[PDB]
Write a protein that binds this DNA or RNA. Structure first.
Lengths: 80, 80, 80, 80
DNA sequence: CTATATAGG
DNA sequence: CCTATATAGG
DNA sequence: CTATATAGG
DNA sequence: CCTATATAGG
């Protein structure tokens, strides 16, 4: 039962890592989005203050991305 | 923190979903590679036994692969 | 030295099949574009009144397209 | 109407560019398949001897493959 | 000698 | 996979 | 038995 | 290409 503690517009917030819809890195930052009851809830926390399960999500996200990319890059070279 | 239990090569294995590096769907089967303490490990359970957590990871990978698929399905119909 | 005789906005026009930049079919029609000295020159002539070299261009165009498509379609199914 | 002259399997061939079904570039080589009277024929000349007409066909195929490549190169950088 | 891009085999 | 083509690379 | 999606071999 | 997994298909 891990929760990512972050701030959004200065206010403290706590999302349930399992309610997080997607993750990605922007430098040192680990941004993400959650389902805050119907709408898109944004948030980002610096890597060093991020729960491990959030980093795992980010990791799998970057891996999932690289793959799609390596696959996209492929179709491009087939067009020279 | 959920230990998904499976049987690989006759060995009743059990890996914490946190170690999961990648999850993908093959029919009604959910396969995944995990961090087998340094090296890449593998395992598969039937969707039926997949803990909701693992299925969420899978749903995140898919949610993304479906967005790019949208753009491709785009640039596609934009035939001529 | 083939020229496609077509009408554009009621006016007669004659483009040099080799000055045609690209072709594609829209039903019975064979549309295309030419380099009318710097800018994009449009035109379309029904298939039955189209020079053979224009049909060959259309043919290769549809073949070139199908290929790119068959290649695009591929990358999509790799994302299920 | 230009007869591109080439040597295939020791046979000094010569096909009217009108019969060309597809042209593509392989290094400084221009390959192409033509309509060998019903069946698909093949041939290749060095860009150097390619009549401007054939090279135009090639330029049309490429012009298009470069547009799709643009959209893919698009949906690509649009990482996250 | 294989690589390169391709279609038919 | 192989072919057949022009040229490159080492 | 292969197909299916995949990563490491 | 092979493996190893759940299930499908015939």
């Amino acid at each position: 039962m891990v929760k990512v503690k972050f701030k959004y517009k200065g206010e403290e917030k706590e999302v349930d890592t399992s309610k997080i819809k997607k993750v990605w890195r922007v430098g040192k930052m680990v941004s993400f989005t959650y389902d805050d009851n119907g709408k898109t809830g944004r948030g980002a926390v610096s890597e060093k203050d991020a729960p491990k399960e959030l980093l795992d999500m980010l990791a799998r996200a970057e891996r999932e991305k690289k793959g799609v990319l390596k696959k996209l890059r492929a179709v491009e070279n087939e067009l020279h």
